[PDB]
């Protein structure tokens, strides 16, 4: 497995080739590469941050195709398994849930969800009716319900 | 051909001090040399990886195995073949100075000299040093007439050693230096990414004038570049 | 350094005497008291008046939540950037006084 | 100046209300002296703070948290 | 030799055997044992020559049997020349161009770094040295060659050895650049 | 007679050690690590293979050469730097 | 105090004629002959900077 | 909560509190409270008020300030001040004095002498 390797000497054209396989424009591809340059140190596995950042932006950009065809979400997961030389489906879900917490409070991640504020206005004001990160999102439960029916 | 290698008296090239103080030589020694390069040991994470990947492969016995793959492709010349190629050009090739390249060398010499005169408010031997580099480039291709392509190559090597050790384009440089002297107090610790989003995105200055103005103010002991040039700190007035 | 504890010891270096400036209040333009208030009252009612009114309407939805904490013995202490004079007089009178008097009858 | 060194010697923290709460209680027990005795103003920028414990008292406190306090003055 | 080296604790047995007359100091025995074996020097396509001699600088307060380690290498290594920093001047370490009292010719006498080829170099009191002798050592720690051109005799001798010095300052609050009376290029070698 | 080589070695592990060692010496103001310190790790690792009469340097000899340079650099600093570098570089020293 | 005189040798037109004479040199009874390459600074100083002057020094 | 960190975060990162929706001046010029905290952090312990006003005036645009103050034809006293050539140098000084005193009441800056008012010090560091 590629996620078990620690301290990998990644180049500058590796993240570009990996982002082109998921059909991503040049605007969202440069933001993922720039996030790795500033976070070169203070990491355990470089493959866990790259895989967690590419799959996080895939559901935001391709949000119009996931709602119409539920098979797009099940296909985008098996593709990353062959590139990472892994066979466990739990490692892919555990990787996209750790990088999302670190990118939940940035600037480039906010403009990506707007083009493709309602939740950040309650955390700073100290509201008791804010969206707690405990339960599963409503848009995620509808995808799993259709995946078990096919 | 004098090929010496000096060392600083403090052990490292102090960027906060003047270049004339770190070098324990007179003014008549730097004027006699043609090219004076400065090898700064910059602590870069992206550079140390490629350097360590080359020294390890050499000591791992792969140095002799890579010679058969590089010589067959025509990318590396052996020592025995390079010995007979230098003497062959030093006795049969006699390059001169073409009249088309003499006007470019005379016009570009005043441009480089005028840049240092504004910062002070380059000797005669420095002009003859570029002629020797331009004539040496024509000897490699066995050309008795030095064309204009060898002139631009000698200027690029001269600005990366001599200049690195000391209409609308000139108007934006003076305005950028006067704006930074007023919008930043004496001792402002502003990052490099912060000032880039205030003069380029506002459609007022270009990226070429930003790196040129920051380098000219550094030689005057006024702007100190810290953290690999990521944080701009003012020192002098 | 700018943030964390490393930024405190780095921004307090020994500044030289020749490196300091001698700029006083002589080169600055002089202003009077009449022109100082006319511009202040104009910028506090027109500059960013729409984002300030839209943000105030968002915090107005927290009025029933603030009253729920005072009924359980939890005192309120507001803070943030700027003054909270207009936010306290509009809540502790136009919301806290009618709700309390209409809930203990 | 106190919060800068306190954050550096603290093991693996920002300055929240819990840090100022322990600092206010440190002055009640007369463990740290100031410039005014009666009617003190904590928000005044001219009032400074200083320690008020001997060396023998501060030695047993650092020994309980496994902190080397004698190497900073050696 | 193959039967003893086949054990899993062959490295720990050599460290414990280095200098048996000194108790403790396990971190210093690992540096002397590694400097005796050295590395594998190899040329880079007939251009550069990477050194393999491990240079160990013994630093610390005197009294911890610092000078006793230097006497152990002279009685165990195949070629070890013990020298000092007070008696050995400019020609005490490198070569020299002396005049023969019989043939009346300019001969060449070897020094400490010349007579210790492919061996171990032992220098005592590295802090009490002149400025003319510190520059000659740094020139031999990188290119492994001492070029001496005196009295018209231009010779470029070789000097490949592991220089194991032992200087004296130790203030823990001060860094190594201020406690030891040395420079930056000297400590980097 | 015996000359060990550097065949089949973790090239990515040596690049991560020098990257974390040089990043800690700048923020703390310790001794700057140049390229000469990187070649010293291979010299100590080659000496460990000679003590075992082996012609190849495995992963066990590489982990022991890094701990020697780390212990020689951490103890050569101040008191506050010794207590800080011993906690960040404890992963490379404590081998599995 | 022993020196009788003391000069301090601290122009776009002067630098143009100097660089032109250097590149032209490397590419190759009473009054002296007027040379356009050697006698270059004497003609400019005689005409007070007039490049279109016809006075031959 | 983080009482000290919330003041420095909301002042520097003003894009998280204000909604990114006189609409031209609100989207091209930073507020007086947000711009003053940016230059206050990127400074040394000794700051000069004569040089801090020039730094704050250089960030505000000149064409957008004069065009915004002339959008109120009801006030006859606002159009008389904008006609003077020193109008941009007087408006920026008024907003600078209102932000300096607002920072002293919160504990961000500190004055030296009482009958001087010429040098300001730093007493709040973001991050610690």
Supply database-style keywords:
part of a larger assembly; 8 chains; A: 150 residues; mainly alpha; 10 helices; 59% helix; D: 74 residues; 3 helices; 2 strands; globular; dna binding protein; DNA replication
Please provide a brief summary of the model:
This is part of a larger assembly, with 8 protein chains of 7 kinds. Chain B is mainly α and about 240 residues long. Helices cover about 55% and strands about 5% of the residues of chain B.
Number of helices of chain E: 7
Assembly annotation: part of a larger assembly
Q: Find the biggest chain interface.
A: C-H, 38 and 50 residues
Number of strands of chain G: 0
Helix content of chain E: 25-40%
Pattern of helices and strands of chain E: HHHEEEHEEHEEEHH
Helix and strand sequence of chain G: HH
Percent helix range of chain G:
25-40%
Spatial separation of the terminal alpha carbons of chain E: 33 Å
For the secondary structure, the number of strands of chain E is 8
Biggest sheet character of chain E: 4 strands, parallel
**Approximate shape of chain E:** globular
Strand content of chain E: 15-25%
Strand order of the largest sheet of chain E: 3-8-5-4
Q: What fraction of the residues of chain G are assigned to beta strands by DSSP? A: under 5%
How far is it from the N-terminal to the C-terminal residue of chain G, by CA? 37 Å
What can you see in these coordinates?
Chain H: It is found in: Nucleus. This is part of a larger assembly, with eight protein chains of seven kinds. Helices cover 59% and strands 0% of the residues of chain A. Chain A is mostly helical and 150 residues long. With 74 residues, chain D is mainly alpha-helical. Chain D is built from three helices and two strands; from the N terminus they run ααββα. Chain D has a two-stranded antiparallel sheet with strand order 1-2. Chain D is globular, with a radius of gyration of 14 Å. Chain D starts with a helix and ends in a 10-residue tail after the last helix. Chain G has 57 residues and is mostly helical. Helices cover 37% and strands 0% of the residues of chain G. Chains in contact: A-B, A-C, A-F, A-H, B-C, B-E, B-F, B-G, B-H, C-D, C-H, D-F, D-H, E-F. The C-H interface holds C 2-5, 7-8, 11-13, 15, 20-21, 23-25, 27-29, 31, 35-36, 38-40, 42-43, 46-51, 54-55, 79-82 and H 3, 6-7, 10-11, 17-19, 21-23, 25-26, 31-33, 41-46, 48-51, 53, 68-69, 71-72, 75, 77-78, 81, 86, 89-91, 93-95, 97-98, 118, 122, 125-128.
């Amino acid at each position: 497995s590629l996620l078990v390797k620690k301290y990998c000497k990644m180049t500058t054209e590796e993240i570009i080739r990996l982002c082109n396989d998921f059909e991503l424009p040049r605007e969202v591809a440069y933001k993922i590469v720039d996030e790795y340059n500033i976070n070169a140190s203070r990491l355990v596995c470089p493959w866990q941050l790259v895989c967690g950042l590419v799959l996080n932006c895939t559901f935001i950009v391709f949000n119009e195709r996931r709602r119409k065809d539920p098979r797009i979400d099940h296909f985008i997961v098996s593709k990353m398994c062959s590139l990472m030389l892994t066979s466990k489906v739990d490692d892919v879900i555990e990787c996209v849930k750790l990088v999302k917490e670190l990118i939940i409070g940035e600037k480039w991640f906010r403009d990506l969800q707007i083009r493709y504020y309602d939740e950040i206005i309650f955390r700073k004001l100290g509201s008791m009716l804010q969206t707690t990160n405990i339960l599963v999102t409503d848009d995620q439960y509808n995808i799993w319900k259709k995946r078990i029916e096919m | 051909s004098v090929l010496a290698a000096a060392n600083p008296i403090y052990g490292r090239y102090d960027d906060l001090k003047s270049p004339g103080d770190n070098i324990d030589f007179q003014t008549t020694i730097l004027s006699r040399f043609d090219m004076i390069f400065i090898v700064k040991d910059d602590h870069n994470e992206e550079r140390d990886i490629s350097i360590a990947n080359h020294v390890i492969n050499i000591h791992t016995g792969n140095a002799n195995a890579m010679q058969n793959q590089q010589e067959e492709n025509g990318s590396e010349i052996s020592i025995e073949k390079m010995k007979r190629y230098i003497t062959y050009c030093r006795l049969k090739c006699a390059p001169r100075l073409s009249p088309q390249a003499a006007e470019k060398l005379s016009s570009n010499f005043v441009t480089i000299r005028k840049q240092l005169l504004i910062n002070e408010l380059i000797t005669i031997r420095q002009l003859e040093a570029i002629i020797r580099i331009t004539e040496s480039l024509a000897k490699l291709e066995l050309s008795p007439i030095a064309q204009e392509r060898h002139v631009d190559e000698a200027i690029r090597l001269f600005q990366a050693s001599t200049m690195d050790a000391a209409g609308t384009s000139l108007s934006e440089i003076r305005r950028f230096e006067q704006e930074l002297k007023r919008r930043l107090p004496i001792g402002w610790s502003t990052s490099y990414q912060t000032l880039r989003r205030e003069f380029v995105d506002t459609h007022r200055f270009s990226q070429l004038a930003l790196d040129k103005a920051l380098y000219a103010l550094e030689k005057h002991e006024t702007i100190q570049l810290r953290h690999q040039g990521q944080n701009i700190y003012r020192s002098g007035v | 350094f700018l943030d964390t504890f490393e930024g405190y010891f780095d921004q307090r270096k020994i500044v030289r005497t020749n490196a300091k400036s001698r700029h006083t209040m002589s080169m600055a333009p002089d202003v009077t008291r009449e022109e100082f208030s006319l511009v202040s009252n104009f910028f506090n009612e027109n500059f960013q008046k729409r984002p300030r009114q839209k943000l105030f309407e968002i915090q107005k939805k927290m009025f029933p939540q603030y009253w729920f904490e005072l009924t359980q013995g939890f005192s309120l202490l507001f803070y943030g950037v700027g003054s909270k004079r207009n936010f306290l007089e509009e809540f502790a009178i136009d919301y806290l006084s009618p709700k309390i008097a209409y809930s203990q009858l | 100046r106190l919060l800068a060194i306190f954050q550096a010697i603290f093991p693996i923290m920002k300055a929240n209300i819990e840090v100022f709460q322990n600092l206010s209680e440190l002055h009640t027990l007369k463990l740290i002296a100031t410039t005014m005795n009666k009617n003190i103003d904590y928000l005044s920028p001219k009032v400074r703070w200083k320690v008020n414990v001997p060396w023998e008292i501060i030695k047993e406190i650092s020994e309980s948290v496994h902190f080397n306090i004698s190497d900073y003055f050696s | 030799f193959r039967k003893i080296s086949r054990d899993r604790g062959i490295i720990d047995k050599i460290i414990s055997s280095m200098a048996p007359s000194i108790y403790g100091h396990r971190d210093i025995k690992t540096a002397v044992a590694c400097s005796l074996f050295g590395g594998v020097p190899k040329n880079v396509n007939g251009k550069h020559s990477i050194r393999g001699d491990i240079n160990v600088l013994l630093l610390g307060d005197p009294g911890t049997a610092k000078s006793q380690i230097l006497k152990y290498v002279e009685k165990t290594a195949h070629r070890a020349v013990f020298a000092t920093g007070q008696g050995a001047s400019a020609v005490g370490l490198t070569a020299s161009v002396r005049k023969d009292p019989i043939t009346k010719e300019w001969t060449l006498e070897g020094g400490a770094l010349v007579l210790a080829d492919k061996g171990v170099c032992l220098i005592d009191e590295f802090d009490k040295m002149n400025d003319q002798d510190r520059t000659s050592i740094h020139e031999a720690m990188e290119q492994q060659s001492i070029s001496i051109s005196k009295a018209g005799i231009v010779t470029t001798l070789q000097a490949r050895c592991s220089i194991i010095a032992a200087a004296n300052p130790y203030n823990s609050t001060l860094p190594l650049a201020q406690n030891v009376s040395l420079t930056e290029p000297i400590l980097s070698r | 007679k015996i000359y060990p080589k550097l065949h089949q070695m973790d090239m990515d592990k040596v690049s991560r050690v020098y990257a974390d060692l040089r990043r800690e010496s700048i923020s703390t103001g310790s001794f700057p690590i140049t390229v000469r310190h990187l070649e010293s790790i291979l010299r100590i690792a080659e000496s460990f293979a000679k003590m075992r009469l082996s012609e190849f340097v495995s992963s066990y000899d590489l982990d022991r050469a890094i701990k020697v340079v780390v212990d020689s650099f951490v103890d050569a600093q101040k008191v506050s730097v010794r207590r800080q570098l011993r906690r960040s570089f404890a992963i490379y020293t404590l081998g599995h | 105090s022993r020196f009788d005189l003391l000069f301090v040798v601290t122009n776009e037109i002067r630098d143009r004629s100097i660089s032109e004479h250097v590149l032209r040199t490397h590419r190759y009874h009473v009054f002296e002959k007027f040379n356009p390459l050697l006698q270059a600074g004497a003609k400019l100083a005689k005409n007070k900077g007039n490049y279109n002057g016809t006075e031959i020094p | 909560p983080s009482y000290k960190s919330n003041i420095e975060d909301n002042l520097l990162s003003w894009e998280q509190v204000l909604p990114s929706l006189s609409g031209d001046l609100d989207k091209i010029m930073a507020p007086v409270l947000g711009q003053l905290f940016k230059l206050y952090r990127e400074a040394n312990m000794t700051i000069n008020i004569y040089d801090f006003y020039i730094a704050f005036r250089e960030t505000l645009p000149k064409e957008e300030i004069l065009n915004f103050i002339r959008k109120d034809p009801s006030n006859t006293k606002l159009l008389e001040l904008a006609e003077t050539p020193d109008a941009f140098d007087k408006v920026a000084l008024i907003l600078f004095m209102q932000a300096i005193f607002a920072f002293e009441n919160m504990g961000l800056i500190k004055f030296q002498s009482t009958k001087s008012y010429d040098l300001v010090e730093k007493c709040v560091w973001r991050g610690i």
